[PDB]
Amino acid sequence: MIQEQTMLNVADNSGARRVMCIKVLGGSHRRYAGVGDIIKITIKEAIPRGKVKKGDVLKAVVVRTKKGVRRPDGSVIRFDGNACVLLNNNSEQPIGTRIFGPVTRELRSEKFMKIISLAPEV
Amino acid sequence: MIGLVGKKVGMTRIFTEDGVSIPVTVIEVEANRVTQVKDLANDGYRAIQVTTGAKKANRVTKPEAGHFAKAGVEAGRGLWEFRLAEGEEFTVGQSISVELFADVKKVDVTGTSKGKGFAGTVKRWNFRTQDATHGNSLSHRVPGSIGQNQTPGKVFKGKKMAGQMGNERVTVQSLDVVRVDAERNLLLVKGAVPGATGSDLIVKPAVKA
Amino acid sequence: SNIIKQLEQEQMKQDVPSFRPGDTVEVKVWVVEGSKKRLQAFEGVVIAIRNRGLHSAFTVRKISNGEGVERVFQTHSPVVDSISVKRRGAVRKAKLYYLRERTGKAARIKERLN
Amino acid sequence: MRHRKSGRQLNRNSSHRQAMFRNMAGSLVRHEIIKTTLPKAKELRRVVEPLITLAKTDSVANRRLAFARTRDNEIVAKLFNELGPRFASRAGGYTRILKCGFRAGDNAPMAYIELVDRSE
Amino acid sequence: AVQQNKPTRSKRGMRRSHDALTAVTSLSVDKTSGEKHLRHHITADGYYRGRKVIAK
RNA sequence: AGGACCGAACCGACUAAUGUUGAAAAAUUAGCGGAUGACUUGUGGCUGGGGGUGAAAGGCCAAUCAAACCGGGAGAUAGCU
RNA sequence: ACACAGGUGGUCAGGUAGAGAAUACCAAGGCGCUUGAGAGAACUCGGGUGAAGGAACUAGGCAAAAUGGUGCCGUAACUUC
RNA sequence: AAUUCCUUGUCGGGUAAGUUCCGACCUGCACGAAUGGCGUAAUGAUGGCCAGGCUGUCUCCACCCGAGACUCAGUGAAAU
RNA sequence: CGAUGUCGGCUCAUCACAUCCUGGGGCUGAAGUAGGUCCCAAGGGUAUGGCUGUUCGCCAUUUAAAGUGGUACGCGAGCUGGGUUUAGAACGUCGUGAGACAGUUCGGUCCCUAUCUGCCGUGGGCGCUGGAGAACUGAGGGGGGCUGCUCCUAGUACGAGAGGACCGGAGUGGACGCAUCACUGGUGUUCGGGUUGUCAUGCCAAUGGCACUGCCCGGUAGCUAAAUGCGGAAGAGAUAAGUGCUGAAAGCAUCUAAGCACGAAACUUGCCCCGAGAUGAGUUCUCCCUGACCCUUUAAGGGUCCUGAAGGAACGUUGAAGACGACGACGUUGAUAGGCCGGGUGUGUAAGCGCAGCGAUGCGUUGAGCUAACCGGUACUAAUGAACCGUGAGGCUUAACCU
């Protein structure tokens, strides 16, 4: 449950450290991002010689949320902190090569397959 | 086809074998027993009137008791009526059980919803609240404007205002029937149906495709 | 609700071990990856238990290679394959939500041993 | 909208209700019959009758537990010394309400609530 | 917020058509004392359902 | 030491909400400024209407102020209603 | 104008905690505010709490939330030092 | 610029995006030297802008506690 | 002009179509994809933010699209009061000056308890022609109609390649609406616990009052949403633009004049709800009432006695019903409410006593004690015998039967 104005952490090593969501893409008056949903972000903080510099505007996929995901048995999985991986803006599949922290079984799709090839858990 | 009259027992869940919880509503459907059959030659329409449950002997009145006595059936807690579907045939006193839904795959459940009393337009019609601060003077949850100006100088019919929400007939359509249990007289449908626990339901087969 | 009480206890698994909050628990969970049905392990401190018969849950908190994770489990789900108690834990409350604010040495639960 | 909630509010806050039933339970234990309003009687049942059942089992923990509720020591003498062994077989229903008209001052539906023995 | 033509006495009585008080409608007779009282209430002498209560 | 600092009494009145046929013809509640000074207060006195007084706003001068109130000229005058 | 939530100078000033005449709870002493009984709708007022987000509200962070004590460490630009 | 019409001047900074804000330029419609010019530490219930924290301000409201509102008894207005 | 409050924001709409999207179609300088342009179409849908008081606009990023207008430039007895446009003050400029400038800047009171219409809900009376209890048909009225993306068909058709379909089907989203509380949560001042100050219960121990519920930590039921189910459809009929078939007037041609077939989210139905005050007051089933006697200005007339049915109403215990009425359940041949019993749930291992310790404390008895609205039972308490209302066979005419 990520919306506009929300500061997310960064899970990959693309260079960003703290980003802000500026749109939730995927529909009209769509309010929330979520489990594996694409957002548009701006970069509010970076490390000094990363691939992405401060104030860039690009896409990301949310990989962890504090709200959490619900499994089909009723079980929830809440994290402690919202996190995203910065995808490339035009043709996706992300920028960074490492992925930190765990991810969830709901990025098990085509594209984000790359993200779960990395990513030490789940 | 016809439906049967149930009773909302409550909600539970049904763990599937592959570990998917299904929220079900349990509907006890006892023997609905036909008290009247209606034909075109006497009524203009083909329909059966069923009863269900049981009523006290001293609480059923003499009109009602004479009706069930003609039908040759025990008095129930109510009378309902189902329109027939052109090739169906029932007799008076015939009992109908939950076994009828052993093929149906998806039903529509009709009950009276829970009465929420005099509700304001934020609960009732999902109006959006005005500012909670920034100057606002005694008008936080109020409906705003209700119409235009000299032209029309009237509030139109069916303007959304506040009043009684709840406690009315609602039908939920296309619910997946999870189990039919002829032993315990139960019907487990997937989802929530209208009404508080113990409320009378009417479960028909789904008319949608 | 003898109908619902009779109907739920037909689904309750029988061998659920006795645990209480504060306990380190390994929970083995069926994870399905396409055709292969794997069984993975989630070990952490029980921070919360809801007892409602069939609708009994319990929340397990792990600090997974980075940040912290809370899985709430439905106890009587067929997904939840095994529960085993690793380290019995001595706390005073019933819901240990204060541990959401503590890491490392502050989030340290004494052992119960009785 | 209230659905299944129990407990009259009685146009008081929670601490004034709590205090008021503590006094009024004390008065019904003391005098064995009091005249109150009909709603205050009907709530006084749910406060008073648990003190009688607590009194049916005499121990130091129940004397102190019925002195936390009720806060009077004569009252927890009559409970545990007189009323508890008086009922002792009566399973609930320690008190009856008898409707008795209306006040003059504000036309309130009064009622005499009394203990169910008063064989004296 | 205020009227614009004085309402009539017609409309006034029409509004008061419902302000009528209902009678008691019949009050019941005690079993022992044989005196009258509201139903489900005690009598003026303090009986109820033929037994003596209060006695003040 | 200090037209010093924080802060009650004390003096004030910055914001908001209520109130606006008020509890009140200017307040209440929650915060707010000064608080040994060009402070504040009691009792008495003095200044008066084109006059007073004014750290000046045309403010204040008995709920009245770009000229008080009362009485009189006076039934002013009103090509206006 | 009221048996009016306002205004009105001086004097006395106990306990515990506290720097304190603040504040909390109390003593001496005085009161329960001259309409009550119910119910527990919308809506209004005064408040409590709130998932995830955290100014996106808005004329404007208005309002609310937050900060808040004592001791010790430590403390920049600029400066009339 | 409390001064600038044209004007949201142009360039730069801050912002994902800045008619406001800061720095600069100077084509000052219509600054300017005790109706003072320009600086200025401290001060301000002063005006404008930014940030950290914080939050029901808001996304989007939900529930609860009280006082009215509603019903009963008594008294019993007002503008129009 | 004995007052019709004037920008903008909010809340809440509503209509038009000169249509932004979705739907149908003709021409194309239409290969496909994407377009351009024109006809038809008003079902539903039709952004969030930076700046600014701004509408507008520019910008950022979305979207199927971010329509154009009317409605006192809709909406201040609905909110705001930022702008304009009172009284204070200053700048630039004008005037000798008082002052002045839709030039600028800072500060600056927005009342109303609704009588009538309207509207949203909700009842009482009477009618419907004997009374009453139910179930209905349905005249009519309202709600709902949005849509993306992915996959298959198919990398086929088309194209030199790049690229890339129509028609048809499956899945899964967004926004919206209905329901619900099983799950995840919120609340939960009525449950349990921790703890600060102080006061009291004689005192220790234990408790209680007050301090915003004193501050907190959890939490039952209920209510709830961020939670979870479901929905918008298929189909039919009559069509719009459009496309035709046969076919003359006009021995050809021609979709039209006779005749015939297609044809869209619009229209009528299909789906959901209200609904016989539908005064055109309908239908069906069932239940109850089968006495005498006077008077007259002899009428569907009035009165007296005897009867009082079916049923309703009142009263009481009340409810996941409720502002109040209303609606639902129960009233002793009875689980309607309270209590009680058992369970569950929540909190988290009470008090007393014993042991260890100098002591704070810790350990044992002990997952203990206490547990609200929950669940299953139980007549212990309260739901009283009765009284009250409602009657006594239901008009006239005509017709068809009285087998």
Short mmCIF file of all heavy atoms in Angstrom, two decimals, chain A residues 65-95:
data_model
loop_
_atom_site.label_atom_id
_atom_site.label_comp_id
_atom_site.label_asym_id
_atom_site.label_seq_id
_atom_site.Cartn_x
_atom_site.Cartn_y
_atom_site.Cartn_z
N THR A 65 6.60 -4.56 1.31
CA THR A 65 5.81 -3.50 1.90
C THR A 65 5.61 -3.79 3.35
O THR A 65 5.70 -4.86 3.81
CB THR A 65 4.37 -3.39 1.29
OG1 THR A 65 3.68 -4.67 1.33
CG2 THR A 65 4.46 -2.90 -0.13
N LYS A 66 5.39 -2.77 4.11
CA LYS A 66 5.07 -2.85 5.52
C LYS A 66 3.73 -3.36 5.65
O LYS A 66 3.46 -3.94 6.66
CB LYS A 66 5.27 -1.38 6.07
CG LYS A 66 5.03 -1.11 7.49
CD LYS A 66 6.10 -1.65 8.34
CE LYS A 66 6.07 -1.11 9.77
NZ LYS A 66 6.20 0.38 9.78
N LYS A 67 2.80 -3.06 4.74
CA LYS A 67 1.38 -3.56 4.82
C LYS A 67 1.30 -5.04 4.65
O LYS A 67 0.60 -5.71 5.40
CB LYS A 67 0.50 -2.95 3.74
CG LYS A 67 -0.98 -3.21 3.89
CD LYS A 67 -1.55 -2.49 5.14
CE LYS A 67 -3.01 -2.80 5.48
NZ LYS A 67 -4.00 -2.73 4.35
N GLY A 68 2.00 -5.52 3.61
CA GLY A 68 2.23 -6.93 3.35
C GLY A 68 1.36 -7.52 2.33
O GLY A 68 0.47 -6.91 1.83
N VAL A 69 1.60 -8.80 2.07
CA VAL A 69 0.90 -9.54 1.03
C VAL A 69 0.13 -10.60 1.73
O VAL A 69 0.57 -11.11 2.78
CB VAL A 69 1.90 -10.12 -0.01
CG1 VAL A 69 2.85 -9.00 -0.49
CG2 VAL A 69 2.78 -11.24 0.59
N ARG A 70 -0.99 -11.00 1.12
CA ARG A 70 -1.78 -12.09 1.63
C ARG A 70 -1.71 -13.28 0.72
O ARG A 70 -1.88 -13.16 -0.47
CB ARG A 70 -3.23 -11.65 1.86
CG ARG A 70 -3.32 -10.88 3.17
CD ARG A 70 -4.62 -10.14 3.43
NE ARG A 70 -5.72 -11.05 3.62
CZ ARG A 70 -5.96 -11.77 4.69
NH1 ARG A 70 -5.19 -11.69 5.71
NH2 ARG A 70 -6.99 -12.58 4.76
N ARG A 71 -1.48 -14.43 1.32
CA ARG A 71 -1.40 -15.69 0.61
C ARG A 71 -2.81 -16.25 0.50
O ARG A 71 -3.73 -15.77 1.19
CB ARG A 71 -0.44 -16.64 1.35
CG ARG A 71 0.97 -16.10 1.41
CD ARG A 71 1.54 -15.94 0.01
NE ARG A 71 2.94 -15.58 -0.06
CZ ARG A 71 3.98 -16.42 0.07
NH1 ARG A 71 3.86 -17.70 0.45
NH2 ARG A 71 5.20 -15.93 -0.17
N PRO A 72 -3.00 -17.26 -0.40
CA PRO A 72 -4.37 -17.79 -0.56
C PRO A 72 -4.91 -18.57 0.60
O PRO A 72 -6.14 -18.78 0.64
CB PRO A 72 -4.27 -18.64 -1.80
CG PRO A 72 -3.18 -18.00 -2.58
CD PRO A 72 -2.16 -17.60 -1.56
N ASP A 73 -4.09 -18.94 1.58
CA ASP A 73 -4.67 -19.52 2.80
C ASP A 73 -5.13 -18.58 3.86
O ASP A 73 -5.73 -19.02 4.82
CB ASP A 73 -3.81 -20.60 3.42
CG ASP A 73 -2.48 -20.13 3.73
OD1 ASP A 73 -2.16 -18.98 3.29
OD2 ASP A 73 -1.73 -20.89 4.39
N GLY A 74 -4.92 -17.30 3.67
CA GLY A 74 -5.25 -16.28 4.72
C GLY A 74 -4.01 -15.76 5.42
O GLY A 74 -4.10 -14.86 6.17
N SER A 75 -2.84 -16.34 5.18
CA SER A 75 -1.63 -15.92 5.82
C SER A 75 -1.12 -14.65 5.17
O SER A 75 -1.08 -14.51 3.97
CB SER A 75 -0.58 -17.02 5.72
OG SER A 75 -1.07 -18.18 6.38
N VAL A 76 -0.68 -13.72 6.00
CA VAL A 76 -0.11 -12.47 5.57
C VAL A 76 1.41 -12.51 5.72
O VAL A 76 1.89 -13.26 6.48
CB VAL A 76 -0.85 -11.33 6.34
CG1 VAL A 76 -0.40 -11.27 7.74
CG2 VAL A 76 -0.63 -9.96 5.65
N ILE A 77 2.14 -11.67 5.05
CA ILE A 77 3.57 -11.54 5.15
C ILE A 77 3.93 -10.06 5.16
O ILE A 77 4.12 -9.41 4.13
CB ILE A 77 4.32 -12.10 3.91
CG1 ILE A 77 3.92 -13.52 3.64
CG2 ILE A 77 5.88 -12.09 4.05
CD1 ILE A 77 4.74 -14.04 2.48
N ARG A 78 4.03 -9.48 6.33
CA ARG A 78 4.42 -8.09 6.47
C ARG A 78 5.92 -7.99 6.66
O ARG A 78 6.52 -8.74 7.45
CB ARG A 78 3.76 -7.59 7.74
CG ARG A 78 2.29 -7.63 7.71
CD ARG A 78 1.79 -6.82 8.92
NE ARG A 78 2.19 -7.49 10.13
CZ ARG A 78 1.48 -8.44 10.68
NH1 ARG A 78 0.25 -8.83 10.19
NH2 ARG A 78 2.00 -9.02 11.76
N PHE A 79 6.52 -7.02 5.99
CA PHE A 79 7.90 -6.65 6.20
C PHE A 79 8.05 -5.51 7.14
O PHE A 79 7.12 -5.18 7.79
CB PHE A 79 8.56 -6.37 4.87
CG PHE A 79 8.69 -7.56 4.00
CD1 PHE A 79 7.75 -7.79 2.95
CD2 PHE A 79 9.72 -8.47 4.21
CE1 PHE A 79 7.84 -8.88 2.13
CE2 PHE A 79 9.82 -9.56 3.38
CZ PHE A 79 8.90 -9.75 2.32
N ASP A 80 9.25 -4.95 7.32
CA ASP A 80 9.44 -3.75 8.16
C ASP A 80 10.07 -2.70 7.36
O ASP A 80 11.28 -2.53 7.38
CB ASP A 80 10.32 -4.03 9.35
CG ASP A 80 9.63 -4.89 10.40
OD1 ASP A 80 8.37 -5.02 10.41
OD2 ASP A 80 10.36 -5.45 11.22
N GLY A 81 9.32 -2.03 6.53
CA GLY A 81 9.91 -1.11 5.59
C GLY A 81 9.52 -1.46 4.21
O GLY A 81 9.65 -2.56 3.81
N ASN A 82 9.17 -0.43 3.45
CA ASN A 82 8.81 -0.59 2.05
C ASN A 82 10.03 -0.50 1.21
O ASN A 82 10.96 0.28 1.51
CB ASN A 82 7.82 0.52 1.64
CG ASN A 82 6.62 0.65 2.61
OD1 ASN A 82 5.99 -0.30 2.91
ND2 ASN A 82 6.34 1.84 3.08
N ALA A 83 10.08 -1.31 0.18
CA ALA A 83 11.29 -1.34 -0.66
C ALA A 83 10.93 -1.60 -2.09
O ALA A 83 9.87 -2.21 -2.38
CB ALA A 83 12.28 -2.35 -0.16
N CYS A 84 11.75 -1.04 -2.97
CA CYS A 84 11.56 -1.19 -4.38
C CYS A 84 12.90 -1.52 -5.06
O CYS A 84 13.94 -1.26 -4.53
CB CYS A 84 10.94 0.05 -4.98
SG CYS A 84 11.95 1.52 -4.89
N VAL A 85 12.82 -2.06 -6.26
CA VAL A 85 13.94 -2.23 -7.14
C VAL A 85 13.72 -1.30 -8.32
O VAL A 85 12.68 -1.34 -8.95
CB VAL A 85 13.98 -3.70 -7.62
CG1 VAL A 85 15.07 -3.88 -8.64
CG2 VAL A 85 14.23 -4.61 -6.42
N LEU A 86 14.71 -0.49 -8.64
CA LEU A 86 14.57 0.53 -9.71
C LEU A 86 14.66 -0.12 -11.07
O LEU A 86 15.66 -0.49 -11.49
CB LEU A 86 15.60 1.67 -9.65
CG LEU A 86 16.08 2.21 -8.35
CD1 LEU A 86 16.80 3.49 -8.65
CD2 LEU A 86 15.03 2.48 -7.29
N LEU A 87 13.55 -0.23 -11.75
CA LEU A 87 13.59 -0.71 -13.09
C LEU A 87 14.07 0.43 -14.02
O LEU A 87 14.02 1.58 -13.68
CB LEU A 87 12.22 -1.15 -13.57
CG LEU A 87 11.49 -2.17 -12.74
CD1 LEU A 87 10.09 -2.26 -13.37
CD2 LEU A 87 12.30 -3.48 -12.51
N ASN A 88 14.53 0.04 -15.21
CA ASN A 88 14.80 0.96 -16.32
C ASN A 88 13.48 1.56 -16.82
O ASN A 88 12.40 0.97 -16.72
CB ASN A 88 15.46 0.22 -17.48
CG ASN A 88 15.97 1.13 -18.57
OD1 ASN A 88 15.92 2.34 -18.44
ND2 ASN A 88 16.49 0.57 -19.63
N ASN A 89 13.56 2.77 -17.34
CA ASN A 89 12.35 3.54 -17.62
C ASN A 89 11.62 3.11 -18.89
O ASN A 89 10.42 2.92 -18.87
CB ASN A 89 12.70 5.03 -17.64
CG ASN A 89 11.48 5.93 -17.51
OD1 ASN A 89 10.32 5.49 -17.54
ND2 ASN A 89 11.77 7.21 -17.37
N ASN A 90 12.35 2.92 -19.98
CA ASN A 90 11.74 2.57 -21.26
C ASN A 90 11.43 1.09 -21.40
O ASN A 90 10.30 0.67 -21.54
CB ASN A 90 12.66 3.01 -22.39
CG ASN A 90 12.70 4.51 -22.54
OD1 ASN A 90 13.73 5.15 -22.31
ND2 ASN A 90 11.57 5.08 -22.93
N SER A 91 12.49 0.29 -21.38
CA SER A 91 12.38 -1.16 -21.47
C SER A 91 12.92 -1.69 -20.17
O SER A 91 14.13 -1.48 -19.88
CB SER A 91 13.22 -1.69 -22.65
OG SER A 91 12.77 -1.16 -23.90
N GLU A 92 12.05 -2.38 -19.43
CA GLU A 92 12.27 -2.64 -17.99
C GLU A 92 13.31 -3.71 -17.73
O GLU A 92 14.16 -3.88 -18.64
CB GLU A 92 10.98 -2.88 -17.31
CG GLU A 92 10.09 -1.66 -17.36
CD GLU A 92 8.66 -2.05 -16.94
OE1 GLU A 92 8.35 -3.27 -16.72
OE2 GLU A 92 7.78 -1.16 -16.91
N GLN A 93 13.28 -4.40 -16.58
CA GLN A 93 14.36 -5.26 -16.24
C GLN A 93 15.45 -4.38 -15.63
O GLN A 93 16.23 -3.72 -16.32
CB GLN A 93 14.81 -6.20 -17.40
CG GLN A 93 13.87 -7.41 -17.55
CD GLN A 93 14.33 -8.37 -18.63
OE1 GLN A 93 15.53 -8.60 -18.78
NE2 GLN A 93 13.38 -8.97 -19.37
N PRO A 94 15.64 -4.53 -14.34
CA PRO A 94 16.27 -3.41 -13.64
C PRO A 94 17.70 -3.11 -13.73
O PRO A 94 18.45 -3.80 -14.37
CB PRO A 94 16.00 -3.75 -12.17
CG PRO A 94 16.02 -5.32 -12.19
CD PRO A 94 15.36 -5.71 -13.48
N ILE A 95 18.06 -1.99 -13.10
CA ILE A 95 19.33 -1.35 -13.28
C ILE A 95 20.38 -2.10 -12.49
O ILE A 95 21.45 -2.47 -13.00
CB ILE A 95 19.25 0.12 -12.86
CG1 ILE A 95 18.30 0.85 -13.79
CG2 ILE A 95 20.64 0.79 -12.93
CD1 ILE A 95 17.96 2.23 -13.30
#
